[PDB]
């Protein structure tokens, strides 16, 4: 993915320090996974992934939508199981506003309807003989400003000769001007192409001026301004014996300038071969045509773009029974690719039991987890927003993104204020008995708790814990995908001049060593592998056990007297 | 604008341009008001004792 926003450049040393209502808000902390979200989103360019490592740049970034209400989920469901690093790509198609004046086309960096609130418009300075540009986007209330644009360096004959002319040509096949020839009473000096080679900046020009005992080329302050040469202006039969002889490139001092401001690319209008169309002083005006446009009825295009990305957990914020069909079979492609992956998901406002068996019936795959629950969350600055259950989802997502590989989210609490339906203890047994998984509630002396019941997937069978417990099967998931990884490049990846097949074996109870070693893997048979070589080819088996956790306790008491 | 017209004429690294102007009390009580480039005397004895990081 794209780390969107890299610094911004500084000017003085100092220490700001101001009031506000809200802070920077959540961070993401270390992890070994990434998880991946869609969503609606206000800002940021479409069918394109960002990466986020704090909450700040996906307010910079994704401006607003009930996206980055699903990371402020992630990050702050749970201090200690904080999620870890993101991956977003909005939904919505959005498009860019545009603004054609003044010999100017103008668009927005910014995609959306937000885009039709820009203001840009140009100005003539009559003190240097030179264009002014301001820029203000009302709505983030930024606001610059450029002056003294396009001028350069002033030129001065200072022979007592009749004449001295300026000029400079103009190439009408790519509508280029890169010639400049200093012509006095007739004769000429010295000729400049702007094409590159001997004097391909502006600065050389200069030097080249100065030598000239007749003439003196002066750099003006205002801005620096050191433009290739071939972006100076046409300019004809300007008189060097004058006072002032400005050398233009006003397209050339908008272009570097213009590229560092925060909202907006500029473009030369071509006239509608058709020559250049001015660029003049004009209006500060609205950019228009930036809409959000309207969401794919397929996402899997949007899915097919996080493919090798490394996102284990991935979770679209709709209850659409299409699109969860769409990432399930986008999950299987990957699985079986290479590219391990869970997904969670879940739908509506308190929707029926049967309804959820609906989607069971239709859906049973251990890649998929499917959350019945829908509930309300309080976030920052107070607000509480109730929200459908894919938001809930995105708690799941975040809290199994922080937990470590060998822990099951199983049992842990959450901090969702409050939840539309109270299910009983035997509501809740025939949603887990039908791989359904939901959140429980308990009552302290004076604490209140939501808790997760137990790991399950929309598979039914319990015969194989890989396939019901997404924990477990994610431990077998990391382990086998970092083991063939690793063994890529010791064998293929690096030069291995000869291999055997009892190598790879040694090779192979060594990592599974190592693994128990660091807790990862309680126990396993080291007798089982089995290795079989076939010219390029080799195949590896091997089996082992899962950890199983702690779910039963039943007591019985009994009073007697003494 | 001045100060300006100094950078537009001279804008070199190996150069560094004061513009504060000031007074300083010295020895036996007299206090002095002095052009920058005494300034720049003590930015340079400042920067003569300083360590080169």
């Given at each position: 993915a794209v780390e969107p926003f890299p610094r911004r450049p500084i000017t003085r040393p100092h220490a700001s320090i101001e009031v506000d209502t809200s802070g920077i808000g959540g961070s993401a902390g270390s992890s070994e996974k990434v998880f991946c979200l869609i969503g609606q989103a206000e800002g940021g360019e479409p069918n394109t992934v960002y990466e986020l490592r704090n909450y700040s740049q996906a307010k910079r970034l994704?401006?607003?939508?009930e996206l980055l209400d699903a990371i402020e989920l992630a990050w702050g469901?749970?201090?200690?199981?904080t999620a870890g690093r993101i991956l977003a790509m909005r939904i919505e198609d959005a498009k860019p506003a545009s603004a054609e004046i003044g010999g100017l086309k103008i668009t927005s960096k910014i995609y959306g309807?937000?885009?039709?609130n820009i203001q840009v418009g140009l100005e003539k300075n009559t003190l240097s003989d030179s264009l002014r540009l301001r820029v203000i986007f009302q709505d983030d209330r930024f606001n610059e400003v450029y002056d003294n644009i396009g001028n350069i360096f002033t030129i001065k004959y200072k022979g007592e000769e009749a004449n001295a002319t300026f000029s400079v040509e103009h190439d009408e096949e790519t509508q280029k001007a890169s010639r400049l020839v200093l012509k006095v009473g007739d004769q000429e000096v010295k000729s400049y192409?702007?094409?590159?080679?001997?004097?391909?900046?502006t600065n050389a020009i200069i030097t080249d001026i100065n030598q000239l005992p007749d003439f003196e080329a002066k750099l003006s302050p205002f801005g620096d301004k050191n433009l290739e040469s071939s972006k100076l202006d046409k300019i004809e039969n300007?008189?060097?014996?004058?006072?002032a002889v400005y050398v233009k490139a006003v397209f050339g001092d908008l272009e570097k300038q213009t590229a560092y401001n925060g909202i907006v690319s500029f473009e030369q209008l071509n006239a509608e071969t058709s020559p250049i169309k001015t660029i003049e002083p004009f209006e500060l005006t609205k950019l228009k045509g930036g809409t959000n446009g309207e969401p794919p009825a397929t996402w899997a295009d949007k899915l097919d773009k996080?493919?090798?990305?490394?996102?284990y957990y991935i979770v679209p914020l709709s209850s659409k029974q299409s699109v969860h069909a769409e990432v399930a079979s986008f999950v299987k492609e990957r699985s079986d690719a290479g590219e391990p992956m869970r997904a969670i998901v879940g739908g509506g406002f308190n929707e029926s039991k049967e309804q959820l068996f609906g989607r069971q019936a239709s859906l049973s795959n251990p890649r998929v987890s499917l959350v019945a629950n829908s509930g309300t969350f309080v976030m920052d600055d107070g607000r509480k927003n109730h929200v459908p259950a894919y938001m809930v989802a995105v708690a799941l997502g975040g809290l199994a993104s922080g937990l470590?590989?060998?822990?099951?989210?199983?049992f842990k609490p959450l901090r969702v204020s409050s939840l539309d339906q109270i299910y009983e203890s035997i509501d809740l047994d025939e949603l887990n008995e039908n791989g359904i998984i939901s959140i429980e509630f308990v009552r302290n002396r004076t604490n209140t708790f939501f808790r997760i019941v137990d790991d399950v997937t929309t598979?039914?069978?319990?015969?194989?814990p890989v396939k019901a417990e997404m924990a477990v099967g994610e431990a077998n998931d990391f382990l086998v995908s970092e083991l063939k990884v690793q063994l890529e490049d010791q064998f293929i990846g690096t030069r291995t001049i000869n291999t055997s097949a009892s190598i790879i074996k040694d090779f192979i109870q060594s990592y599974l060593g190592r693994k128990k070693r660091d807790n990862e893997i309680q126990d396993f048979p080291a007798e089982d592998v089995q290795v079989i070589v076939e010219g390029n080819e080799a195949r590896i088996s091997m089996t082992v056990y899962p950890i199983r956790s702690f779910k039963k306790i039943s007591v019985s008491l009994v009073y007697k007297q003494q």
């Open positions: 994704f401006r607003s939508g469901s749970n201090p200690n199981y309807n937000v885009a039709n192409d702007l094409t590159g080679g001997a004097y391909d900046y300007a008189n060097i014996k004058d006072k996080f493919a090798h990305e490394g996102g470590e590989i060998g822990e099951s989210i199983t598979f039914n069978d319990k015969s194989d």
